[model samples]
Target: KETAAAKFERQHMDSSTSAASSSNYCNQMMKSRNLTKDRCKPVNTFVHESLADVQAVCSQKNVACKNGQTNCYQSYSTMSITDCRETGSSKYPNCAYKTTQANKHIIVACEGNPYVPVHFDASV
Candidate 1:
């Protein structure tokens, strides 16, 4: 089973690349990370910050969940991130996305034991 922390790392963390200069990042990452294995995730954000900095978003700032869920927090300051938005033709087994890197406030959902980020909610 995938732990909350592990899942967060798989789905959102991208410590290898600070900025995605090529157009293929989302296409490669989304699939490589297994996010596209089942179906394309419409919109997702990859934080380029370290795990500690990313985890700290839990107490960085309080914000209403953009999608109106719970336990969501926004970064107190803008952070480095890459936004991945699946293109219109995205589909299972052959998904594709448009990549854009920006400095923005990120929102994440926390959970369990240590109460660290379990989901990448959004980047505003």
Candidate 2:
């Protein structure tokens, strides 16, 4: 069973990639990481930073969640991240994505025990 923390790491962690320049990066990653099983995940961001730095986001300033919820926090540091979005023509099982890397402050939704990120809301 995948716990929330583990699931977060699986989908969002990417310390090994300094940048993601091509559509292939997202195309391959989104599938290899199991996010493309049933359908293309509309949008996802992979942070290229230490797990510790990502966890620390919970202590940052609060922000309104993308869904208008109140449990999100925005990181103070600018981080390297690759944003993956499903291509407009992409369909299930043939999921395709566009990848773009940028340095931005991340907004994450936190939860549980010691308070860690469970959802990546957006980057600003």
Candidate 3:
């Protein structure tokens, strides 16, 4: 079985373009990435940066996560990102979503000896 860390990487990592301009990107990616396999995920995000760039966030300053954890870290520099939100027509087996692209500082929770991101907390 895959751990949360691997799931996070599978769900969030996207080293494609700095920005995704297609309006159907979220709908496509969410399904392509298997985030909508069971049900419509309310919200999701994808980082357009490299794995190393995102992994480096573990070494940044620690901050409080939405769940109030202290292992969270906010990225020092803003990075290209895409946000996916369920649309009004969203429904299981036929999930719909809207995509919004932005460049912002990411927040994530890290763990383990190598200290890699396990949870994507938020963006600012």
List pairs with backbone clashes in candidate 1. none
Candidate order by TM-score, decreasing, is 3, 2, 1
Model 2, 1-81: lDDT tens digits are 998878999999988867786768998898889999887789989999999999999999899997998989999989999
For each candidate, what TM-score against the reference?
Answer: 0.90, 0.93, 0.97
Best by lDDT: 3
lDDT of 3 at 46: 96
The all-Cα superposition gives candidate 2 an RMSD in Å to the true structure of 1.3
RMSD of each: 1.5, 1.3, 0.8
Estimate the overall C-alpha local distance difference test score of candidate 1. 0.85
Looking at candidate 2, what is the lDDT of residue 77?
Answer: 88
Per-residue lDDT of candidate 1, residues 1-124 (tens digit): 9987898899889888788878898898898888877678888888888989998888777777767877899888898898899888877778889999899998888877788998787778
Candidate 3 has its poorest 10 consecutive residues by lDDT at 16-25
RMSD of model 3 against the true structure:
0.8
lDDT of each: 0.85, 0.90, 0.92
Error of 3 at 72 (Å): 0.3
Identify the candidate with maximal TM-score: 3
* Collision count for each candidate, in order: 0, 0, 0
